[PDB]
């Protein structure tokens, strides 16, 4: 069975997530309305900007994160933001229509919508595939949340100074998840492996997203549609 | 009577204005919706950002502007943007309710609304007074447009290199307006003077706006609500 500290960590993450993930999606009405050159950029820019703020809120609650140097926290957020965001979005992803449903039909996104935000199938194909394979793992809230904490605490990111203290925090988390799957998840003898593999898929997606983003960020007619926070987090001006 | 070149200038400005000033205000639905700490900042930031793009469109059509150095064009836009914007807004200002009406009730702004965007009466009092006195001059479209071209072509702005070529372009404009008032505007024996005085009021407003803006721009929780274009035009990173 799980230890108290192991369980306290799970309770902390699940609560940090609930506190940073709004199931009513009542904030999407405050974004620049979606329009279906790059007509979806304004809306999706606000979505991502809003999601970054949520990921930051979450990160600050991951046990051990608050004690790192501001520099490492930055290095970790900047390098994993988009992957965490892709992980968070799976909650609203549907295996039927292969889309994201966030309240109303206005906020129902298809692969076509991201295309109108400057992205190509070069990225979207692997993205939907990742969403589908992830959705199929039918993760418990506790595993989904651990995966996001595991992801955010990867020491193998550029700019990370103390990759020993972070290597540790992630190890601690990785075993919590490993223990949880073995104790609380029936038919999950080979789930952990599949999950770690999902983290590897994220890297590829991250690489591809950054490429296409860089392309977009160098065109001022498009960069001007971005928000300050997005430009700072996806920027290279580190 | 007016000369052909004098009239061609008037026709060019009136057409540049019509091409950059949308009377249907059908673009306000694309802004982050208004919300009545600094709840109006998002919406009013998008309004101003959109207005800057219109002022730039207009400027590029002012005869003589396109031939200046990119540097002077920048120096002129950055220093006069807010004044031109205050001048443009008068078109939707009403002497009855003392507000700005841009289509629907959602887009009806009161002094209270700007307060929710980080501004104080220190600025808003003089602002409404300027709007009222301006509205009372009952300018013809030709005079209102000349005033905006006159304003934008003020050589006495920081960063202006060739204030001789610009001093000239503005002189040319100032006499066009002076001639128009004398020939086409009955009961306007003392209008020109009142107009030039209105340009002086704008300077005070500009000074005050920049002060309060600087205050806001140094607070990242607020600066992040701004748009790239606003930050660049009201920024000091010249």
């Amino acid at each position: 069975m799980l230890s108290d500290e192991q369980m306290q960590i799970i309770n902390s993450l699940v609560e940090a997530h609930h506190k940073t993930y709004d199931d009513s999606y009542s904030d999407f009405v405050r974004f620049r309305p979606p329009v279906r050159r790059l007509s979806m950029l304004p809306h999706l820019a606000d979505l991502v900007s809003y999601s970054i703020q949520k990921v930051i809120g979450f990160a600050k609650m991951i046990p051990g994160f608050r004690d790192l140097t501001a520099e490492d926290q930055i290095a970790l957020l900047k390098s994993s933001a988009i992957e965490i965001i892709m992980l968070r979005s799976n909650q609203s992803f549907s295996l039927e229509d292969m889309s994201w449903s966030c309240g109303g039909p206005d906020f129902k996104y298809c692969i076509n919508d991201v295309t109108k935000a400057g992205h190509t199938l070069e990225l979207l194909e692997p993205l939907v595939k990742f969403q589908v394979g992830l959705k199929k793992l039918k993760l418990h809230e506790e595993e989904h949340v651990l995966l996001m904490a595991i992801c955010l605490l990867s020491p193998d990111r550029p700019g990370v100074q103390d990759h020993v203290r972070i290597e540790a925090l992630q190890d601690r988390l990785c075993d919590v998840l490993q223990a949880y799957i073995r104790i609380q998840h029936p038919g999950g003898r080979l789930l952990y492996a599949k999950m770690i593999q999902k983290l590897a898929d994220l890297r590829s997606l991250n690489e591809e997203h950054s490429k296409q983003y860089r392309s977009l960020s160098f065109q001022p007619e498009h960069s001007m549609q971005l928000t300050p926070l997005v430009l700072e987090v996806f920027g290279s001006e580190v | 009577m007016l000369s052909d070149e004098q009239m061609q200038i008037i026709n060019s400005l009136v057409e540049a204005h019509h091409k950059t000033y949308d009377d249907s205000y059908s673009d306000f639905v694309r802004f982050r919706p208004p919300v009545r700490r600094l709840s109006m900042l998002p919406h009013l930031a998008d309004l101003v950002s959109y207005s800057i793009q219109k002022v730039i469109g207009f400027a590029k059509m002012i005869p003589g502007f396109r031939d200046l150095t990119a540097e002077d064009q920048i120096a002129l836009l950055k220093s006069s943007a807010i004044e031109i914007i205050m001048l443009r807004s008068n078109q939707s200002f009403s002497l009855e309710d003392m507000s700005w009406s841009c289509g629907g009730p959602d887009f009806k702004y009161c002094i209270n609304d700007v307060t929710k965007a980080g501004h104080t009466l220190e600025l808003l009092e003089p602002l409404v007074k300027f709007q009222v006195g301006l509205k009372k001059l009952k300018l013809h479209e030709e005079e209102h447009v000349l005033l905006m071209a006159i304003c934008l072509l003020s050589p006495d702005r920081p960063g202006v290199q060739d204030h001789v070529r610009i001093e000239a372009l503005q002189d040319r404009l100032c006499d066009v307006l002076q001639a128009y008032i004398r020939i086409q505007h009955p009961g306007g024996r003392l209008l020109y003077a009142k107009m030039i005085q209105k340009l002086a009021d704008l300077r005070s407003l500009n000074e005050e706006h920049s002060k309060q803006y600087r205050s806001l721009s140094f607070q990242p929780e607020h600066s992040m609500q701004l748009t790239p274009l606003v930050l660049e035009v009201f920024g000091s990173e010249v």
Partner: peptide, 10 residues
Amino acid sequence: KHKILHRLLQ
């Protein structure tokens, strides 16, 4: 500069 990120991380 990352000034926005620093403020949010406080």
